[PDB]
Design a protein around this ligand. Sequence first.
Ligand code: MG
Ligand code: MG
Length: 132
Amino acid sequence: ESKRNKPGKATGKGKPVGDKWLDDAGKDSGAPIPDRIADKLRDKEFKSFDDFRKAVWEEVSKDPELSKNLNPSNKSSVSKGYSPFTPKNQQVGGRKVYELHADKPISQGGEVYDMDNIRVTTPKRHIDIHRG
DNA sequence: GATCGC
DNA sequence: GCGATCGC
Ligand SMILES: [Mg+2]
Ligand SMILES: [Mg+2]
């Protein structure tokens, strides 16, 4: 029974970025996690990490700035709290959306709802990070 | 099994 | 609950 199943409260300050944040997502560390987003949710006791994610994208959807750079089809996803798709070259088979990755692995004392520890990646990066 | 998503 | 991918 993993620590991302059982409930917990949101913690973290975030990081400053632009509306062109998802290049770094395919690159190294990844894209950061927005501080507008962080503040919007700091200290909300969430039921599961599935509950948290919905609340992250849904706030991206209510955010006119970060949604600005998504097509009419991804503004939808986030508008119901779903991850938007990545570009095809960044996808791996049937793993197609952006993925919220625990920078420090949870098993090594990485905290689940530690927004400062969450980085955003394309599947192709997410795999490579977990190798190189 | 680990760690991401619906 | 279910589906995906990597696996040294
Ligand atoms: Mg990982
Ligand atoms: Mg298995």
